[PDB]
Amino acid sequence: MKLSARNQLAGKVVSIKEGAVNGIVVLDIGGGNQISSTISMDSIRELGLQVGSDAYAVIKATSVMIGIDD
Amino acid sequence: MKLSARNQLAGKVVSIKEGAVNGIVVLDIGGGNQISSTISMDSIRELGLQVGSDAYAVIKATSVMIGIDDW
Amino acid sequence: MKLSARNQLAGKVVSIKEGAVNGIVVLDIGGGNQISSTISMDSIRELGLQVGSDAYAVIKATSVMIGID
Amino acid sequence: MKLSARNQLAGKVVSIKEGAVNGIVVLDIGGGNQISSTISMDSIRELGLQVGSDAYAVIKATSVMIGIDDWS
Amino acid sequence: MKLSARNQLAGKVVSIKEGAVNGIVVLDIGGGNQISSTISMDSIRELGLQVGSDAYAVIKATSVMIGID
Amino acid sequence: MKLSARNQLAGKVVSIKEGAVNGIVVLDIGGGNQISSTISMDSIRELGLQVGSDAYAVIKATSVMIGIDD
């Protein structure tokens, strides 16, 4: 599928923290940036995610806030 | 001032497209990646955002999905 | 791409409301159900969406609430 | 309450996966479609949800993305 | 309808900014707090919102972040 | 940091429900109103949140729906 989400950032899985219904996936997207994703354990298994998997952090633009230094 | 959001990615504003009540801010976060943010025009004005401003893309972890090529 | 979003519902575009930076796409997903999506105009253009296009409504499970009567 | 969310899809609960603080409710909304909802266990209990319960999948329009096929 | 959303805060509409497909509604929920909501123009009209309307700010718990000084 | 999120409501933590990867923090914002927040356990630990802590409920405007009596 091709998605409307304005943010689709390629990266490598560096860690997966497993929970009961959700887990947290951390993706190294390069340049010293990492993105954490809280998704269903079901999806983590269905996408075959492991440490080292190539993947994408997918973020709808309406979910992104802008911050600045004080 | 300090936020629970797991994702707070520093970058520079490269573009601002103004809309009626919302605008879209694009941030260069380095490593060849850009992030687009759809936020209120009032916030764009209140934060003083301009092309070239230093800022952060702030994303709650529950807002991030994972995709794969799945070839 | 294959996506983690639990909800990926096939449908046909029945209307597109064009706005300034966002638009609203309505999808007929069958069963008498329609889904409205508020997305960027840029994405509406890049995906080539028109009335009659085949598409999918994609929703992360953490975005779905449950209501009852 | 009457809610602004553009998407309020009636369906029947087909499964509930209970966890420690959250659960996943799956709704059959007809037409061969199901919707999964990740919500708090407290909300699942307070709403009295059971398999077979009549309910609604409620989705704000700004939460919905559009996808197309890879060859499109 | 009764909703799973953990946050349902009563208030009065103090401002409405109209846009193309969305508008922003400001609700004074008492105690000096106001909540701003960006929703479709269609919903603003369908709910009959005006300055002075009684309404509720409805927020899913997974949408709320915590900040500290 | 200063954030674009239009909703930033001060309160005190009244309860924290712990899970494996997420927890639910309840904030008393006064006036008989409480706000529940489902966030990562890692964030709850990093922010030092306790029962009694002073904090803020932070909500993006696009995450807020409006309801009315019917």
* C-beta atoms of F4 and B56 within 8 A: no
Rounded to an integer, what distance in angstroms lies between the CA atom of residue C60 and that of residue D14?
A: 18
Paired tokens of C39: 């997305």
E61 neighbourhood in chain F, CB within 8 Å: 24, 36-38
Domains of chain A from N-terminus onward = 7-58 (2.40.50.100)
CA dihedral E28, E29, E33, E34 (to 10 degrees): -40
Contact present, C32 and C9 (Cβ < 8 Å): no
Contact present, B28 and B11 (Cβ < 8 Å): yes
Q: How many beta carbons lie within 10 A of that of residue E22, not counting itself?
A: 32
Report which of D5, F45, D14 is spatially closest to residue E3, judged by C-alpha positions: D5
Rounded to an integer, what distance in angstroms lies between the CA atom of residue B55 and that of residue B29?
A: 9
Q: Which residue has the tokens 């996936």?
A: A25
Q: Which chains touch C (3 or more CB pairs under 8 A)?
A: A, B, D, E
Q: How many beta carbons lie within 10 A of that of residue C50, not counting itself?
A: 10
Which residues are CB-neighbours of B9 under 8 A, at least 6 positions away?
A: A33, A35, B27, B29, B35, B56, B57, B58, B59
The angle subtended at Cα D69 by Cα C32 and Cα A48, nearest 5°, is 100
E22 neighbourhood in chain C, CB within 8 Å: 19, 22, 38
CA dihedral B5, B10, B15, B16 (to 10 degrees): 40
A11-16, long-range: CB < 8 A, 24+ apart: A11/A35, A11/A54, A11/A55, A11/A56, A11/A57, A12/A52, A12/A53, A12/A54, A12/A55, A13/A49, A13/A50, A13/A51, A13/A52, A13/A53, A13/A54, A13/A55, A14/A51, A15/A51, A16/A44, A16/A49, A16/A50, A16/A51
D contact residues 13-42, partner C, Cβ 8 Å cutoff: 24-25, 27, 29-33, 35-39
Resolution (A): 1.8
Residue C38 bridge partners (DSSP): C24
F39 neighbourhood in chain E, CB within 8 Å: 64-66
Paired tokens of A64: 């992104």
DSSP run (H or E) holding C57:
strand C54-59
Rounded to an integer, what distance in angstroms lies between the CA atom of residue B36 and that of residue A64?
A: 7
Which residues are CB-neighbours of E56 under 8 A, at least 6 positions away?
A: D1, E8, E9, E10, E11, E27, F66, F67, F68
Which residues are CB-neighbours of D7 under 8 A, at least 6 positions away?
A: C35, C36, D57, D58, D59, D60, D61, D64
Helices then strands, counting H and E runs in chain A, come out as 1, 6
Q: Which technique?
A: X-ray
Helix, strand, or coil (residue C42): helix
Q: Write the DSSP assignment of chain D as a string of letters.
A: -EE--SEEEEEEEEEEEE-SSEEEEEEEEETTEEEEEEEEHHHHHHTT--TT-EEEEEE-GGG-EEEE-TT-
Rounded to an integer, what distance in angstroms lies between the CA atom of residue D71 and that of residue E40?
A: 32
Q: Where are the beta strands (DSSP E) in chain B?
A: 2-3, 7-18, 22-30, 33-40, 54-59, 65-68
* C-beta atoms of C67 and E19 within 8 A: no
